[PDB]
């Protein structure tokens, strides 16, 4: 497979493996929280990362970084501060940056 794609796929797999991914897996349920998309007019989630990756959105890892940071941002913006969601996003962030430092 293409080196970048494969790297990002592995990185994404690691991200999904990292428990803290849990809240951000699927898109926010429009039926329940439509307001997510109306406020956070910058949608992303890990399924969407997978879609974008498959769609070769991430022409450079920098864009993956940006979008993952977008998940973190979206979370912290939308959810009340210092929540389980914030903690999860923070664990995700640290884990992610750790993976980046590893490779």
Curated annotation (Swiss-Prot):
Membrane spanning residue stretches: none
The protein's name in its UniProt record: Histone acetyltransferase KAT2A
Assembly and interaction partners: Homooligomer; may form a tetramer of homodimers. Interacts with EP300, CREBBP and ADA2. Component of the TFTC-HAT complex, at least composed of TAF5L, TAF6L, TAF3, TADA3L, SUPT3H/SPT3, TAF2/TAFII150, TAF4/TAFII135, TAF5/TAFII100, KAT2A/GCN5L2, TAF10 and TRRAP. Component of the STAGA transcription coactivator-HAT complex, at least composed of SUPT3H, KAT2A, SUPT7L, TAF5L, TAF6L, TADA3L, TAD1L, TAF10, TAF12, TRRAP and TAF9. The STAGA core complex is associated with a subcomplex required for histone deubiquitination composed of ATXN7L3, ENY2 and USP22.
Protein location: Nucleus; Chromosome; Cytoplasm, Cytoskeleton, Microtubule organizing center, Centrosome
Annotated tissue distribution: Expressed in all tissues tested.
Domain comment as written in the entry: Loop3 is required for substrate specificity and adopts different structural conformations in succinyl-CoA-bound and acetyl-CoA-bound forms.
Phosphothreonine modification, residue list: 6
Annotated function: Protein lysine acyltransferase that can act as a acetyltransferase, glutaryltransferase, succinyltransferase or malonyltransferase, depending on the context. Acts as a histone lysine succinyltransferase: catalyzes succinylation of histone H3 on 'Lys-79' (H3K79succ), with a maximum frequency around the transcription start sites of genes. Succinylation of histones gives a specific tag for epigenetic transcription activation. Association with the 2-oxoglutarate dehydrogenase complex, which provides succinyl-CoA, is required for histone succinylation. (Microbial infection) In case of HIV-1 infection, it is recruited by the viral protein Tat. Regulates Tat's transactivating activity and may help inducing chromatin remodeling of proviral genes.
Residues of the full protein shown: 730 to 832 of 837
Crosslinked residue numbers (Glycyl lysine isopeptide (Lys-Gly) (interchain with G-Cter in SUMO2)): 30, 62
Domain Bromo: 1-103
Signal peptide: none
Family: Belongs to the acetyltransferase family. GCN5 subfamily.
Gene from which the chain derives: KAT2A
